[PDB]
User: Fold Non-structural protein 3 from Severe acute respiratory syndrome coronavirus 2.
Amino acid sequence: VNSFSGYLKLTDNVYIKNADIVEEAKKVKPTVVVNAANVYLKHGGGVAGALNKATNNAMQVESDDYIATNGPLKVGGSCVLSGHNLAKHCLHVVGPNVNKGEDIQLLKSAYENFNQHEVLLAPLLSAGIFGADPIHSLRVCVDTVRTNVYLAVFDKNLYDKLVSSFL
Ligand SMILES: O[C@]1(CNc2ncnc3[nH]ccc23)C[C@H]2CC[C@@H]1CC2
Assistant:
């Protein structure tokens, strides 16, 4: 039993809610919140911009030190950093950005990072400003993640389409 509330159960391990991931994180304070990161950990917009703003830019400061030490992530890769005031940990995961021409097959590799964590609050990878089809992202999530994932979908109109079209 966990403290996630109001989610629709899609499968054995995947749950979905129309919610602002920032507000969800502040309420639940989960062990792991997933960020929709880029390889440079430049949290300018989308989910990343919103999560970073909620940390008063502390996420960006930590991220800049991480990149200065380690260099960029791989598309499809991840790193674990602090969750600041939002969660114990933040799993920064880089899904392919279709608006940069990146290979959508890497979306499965991106979701595989979730399997290293028993429970996660997460957005749909590569959705929003990363330009992938969120219906496809949900399908890859369900077919790849085996740990317990609670998906927050900000857009209510999108949330309803994801549920009604879910196979
Ligand atoms: O890019 C996404 C993800 N963006 C977010 N998802 C959850 N909480 C959030 N808080 C701030 C931004 C944000 C994927 C779909 C739903 C919303 C947008 C556009 C389409």
